Write a protein that binds this ligand. Structure first.
Ligand code: GCP
Ligand code: EZZ
Ligand code: MG
Length: 163
């Protein structure tokens, strides 16, 4: 079966771990336990194809160069109530594009914490940025699990399209 190496990137606190844990364990992590590095495996069925997801959950370096080279697809995560994390997105995309020496790298823009009321990043703002990059935009909530499977499965489909 096909294996997909996915990397979850973004500013410290956007919900990279909570999104990953919701995907893998169907569990919401309320606590804020900072990540050094953690990878997870999950067998899933996407478009009738049973495949293996190998997901790397990163810290919000030679180690960074290595996983960006290895990573087939990237979830660029920001929190919808955090303008600073949205402003950070281009820095992550720039690092990945530089390491992979490609303007065509499978990526998905993820607007997390969509369950929270005081939103500072509009859907239009996020959609316009994702459109300028030629990538999908998915609104997610690691709290309710809204859009979690969508973000990861969409990334897998972007990888399938690329190859
Ligand atoms: N309400 C709400 N809270 C969230 C959501 N996602 C994450 N959180 C909360 O934000 C905090 C940080 O989440 P975490 O997943 O640890 O973020 P992170 O980006 O991995 C932090 P680091 O970069 O240090 O590894 C946690 O308290 C978590 O419960 C969400 O979608 N909605
Ligand atoms: C192979 N799996 C058991 C673990 C795993 N899953 C991934 C998903 C996306 C990208 C990389 C990886 C890796 C590792 N492969 C590396 O090159 C690397 C560098 C730094 C790390 O912290 C981890 C890895
Ligand atoms: Mg984390």
């Amino acid at each position: 079966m096909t294996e997909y190496k996915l990397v979850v990137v973004g500013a410290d606190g956007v919900g990279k771990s909570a999104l990953t844990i919701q995907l893998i364990q169907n569990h919401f992590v309320d606590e804020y336990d900072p990540t050094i590095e953690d990878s997870y495996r999950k067998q899933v069925v996407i478009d009738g194809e049973t495949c293996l997801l190998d997901i790397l959950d990163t810290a919000g370096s030679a180690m960074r160069d290595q996983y960006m080279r290895t990573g087939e697809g990237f979830l660029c995560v920001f929190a919808i109530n955090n303008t600073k994390s949205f402003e950070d997105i281009h820095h992550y995309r720039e690092q990945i594009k530089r390491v992979k020496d490609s303007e065509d790298v499978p990526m998905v823009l993820v607007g997390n914490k969509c369950d929270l009321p005081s939103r500072t990043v509009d859907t239009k703002q996020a959609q316009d940025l994702a459109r300028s990059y030629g990538i999908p935009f998915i609104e997610t909530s690691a709290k309710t699990r809204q859009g979690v499977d969508d973000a990861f499965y969409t990334l897998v489909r972007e990888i399938r399209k690329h190859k």
